[model samples]
Target: KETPAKFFQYGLTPDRDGIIITRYLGKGIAVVLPSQIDGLPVVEVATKAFYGCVSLVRVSLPSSVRMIGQHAFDGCTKLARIELPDGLREIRHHAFHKCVSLAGIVFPRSLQVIGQDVFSSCGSLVDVVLPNSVKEIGSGAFRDCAELASVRLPVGVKNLADGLFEGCRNLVELGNLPEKVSFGVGVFVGCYRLPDVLKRSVRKLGYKGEFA
Candidate 1:
């Protein structure tokens, strides 16, 4: 008796603009992009595009692209590096959730808004630099990044949603919270290792109560 072939679409090209080089391509493997595809620049990557690609080691995003939709790269466990394009204006909800090996990402100066849980569960993310151009950081933006040790807030951020950095166990510093603003509830809930002076400074700013 012959067995049937389970559906694996590794070499198939979807009609969408952006492409996934591997689908269920095993764990701890790299997905390299073909040097050229026709003549057009790869523009946009749709939401849930690379979901559950556990072995994804690297991905090349073209500078010509402008947006990365919500949950686009969610659950890519071995994805270690990513370079956002300069034209990216926003990173929608849960874009890079559960990418445990991601060490860092450069938030572009052109990035103006970030949605909920964008970097949540990135267990190895150690440092992040927020540019002054960022206006809003939605709920749980960097939550559950247990290895995130330091964060530098930008000057123009007016609202920091609830539980933004919850479960960041290794966080030692919360550099600067905007002078006259309120931080959300459970913002540092599981950050047991945060410095006492930093906590005192945060409390002195009247962030002792719940925020919206």
Candidate 2:
């Protein structure tokens, strides 16, 4: 017989007329988030909620989760994958920082903002296309992603934070820059094989064309 699905053990902090998940205190390889904690929607995943666990293999978030706090999954060296639920809006800074074994991610709809260093140092990531709904991505978003060679940024993105793709030494193509897209210092700094046409435009747009 198939076993019933179970939510991990967590503490409920009751306050202000509702309950909230203060932290996850489970010890296992796979985790499934609880949809409702004592009748209140689990709105957020606390900071460092899964930091440095190193043993977790995967995680599933519930639809009611709207935000993921900073360093929530940072340094989870053995974690291979996790899908962001559709209703999730904000992924705080360094949410996936230094997850060395992570290989892929699919962003959810209406994911308007992504915090700093979200995908930095994920050595095994091969491909990811940020959906157009994103408007702001923080600095060093994809830094030092050695094996990352393909990516696409949409036209609606108005701010290209500093060092956005720094140290992505293997990148070969960026679909195309939007008509009025902006850049920060050394946005494409260490991408040595970037196309010359794009390199020239980077100069006229007032960003240093140091394609080193």
Candidate 3:
């Protein structure tokens, strides 16, 4: 078994035009990604690039990045803050799952999709305001984020995936759930602090027994 020896291990993109960061080998508490490496624009962060990076508290991404692969920052429990670049388009499944210290996030306007379990189990996460450009959010995207308190879902969101906010016990304030957004089973399960009116709203939409 071999470990990546460089601070920022990288490789050429599949199309052989840009660069993708394959791994992070440093022990720094904060990381600032470079915009380019070897004269190629850093277009993406590969899967599991920073998995289990417990020492990292913050990260600053480069503007050249567009996509963040699945599990890119999984289990980074101490990751409290990060900046998403302007052009980021998609974030795959479990990209920031188990990042328990994350307190908040601001979605980039260019983001279109959020994959399943992307922020699941992020215990310290408090609030989120999804950007209007977001068109899709996968199931369980914010599941088990116990400290989550408020959220503002964008009007462009048309579906509330299964277990989307399951186990968010502290959640109380929620913005409009978009006139056209539909609910999935258990979308608000275990949300003890949510308003009864909101619960009734979902029930009116045909979701039964989704609250605790």
Instruction: For each of the candidates, give the backbone clash count.
Output: 0, 0, 0
- Candidate 3 or 1, higher lDDT: 3
Instruction: Look at candidate 3 and tell me the lDDT of residue 110.
Output: 92
Top candidate on lDDT is 3
lDDT of 3 by residue, 1-212 (tens): 11223579999988988889989989888888888776788899999999999999999887889999999999999998999999799999999999999999888889998999999999999999987888889999999999999988887677789999999999988786765567787888999998888877767766765686
Select the stronger candidate by lDDT from 2 and 3: 3
Candidate 1 residue-wise lDDT, 1-212, digit = tens: 11111212223235654433233233435543332244434445557767888767776555654567788889988889876767667888998999999998887778888899999999999999888888878999999999999998888566567999888889887666777667788887888897778777778766764321
Local accuracy of candidate 2 as per-residue lDDT tens digits, 21-91: 44555557867676676566666787888888787888777777888889889998988878678988888
What's the candidate order when arranged by decreasing lDDT?
3, 2, 1
lDDT, residue 127, model 2: 84
TM-score winner between 1 and 3, please give it.
Answer: 3
What lDDT would each prediction earn against the true structure? 0.72, 0.76, 0.88
CA error at residue 132 for candidate 3, angstroms: 1.0
Q: How accurate is candidate 3 locally (lDDT)?
A: 0.88
Error of 1 at 57 (Å): 0.8
Give the clash count for model 1: 0
Which candidate number would show the highest TM-score if scored against the true structure?
Answer: 3
If scored against the real structure, what TM-score would every candidate get? 0.80, 0.87, 0.94
Off by over 4 Å in 3: 1-6
**How accurate locally is residue 31 in candidate 1, as Cα lDDT from 0 to 100?**
42
Worst 10 residues of 3 by lDDT: 1-10
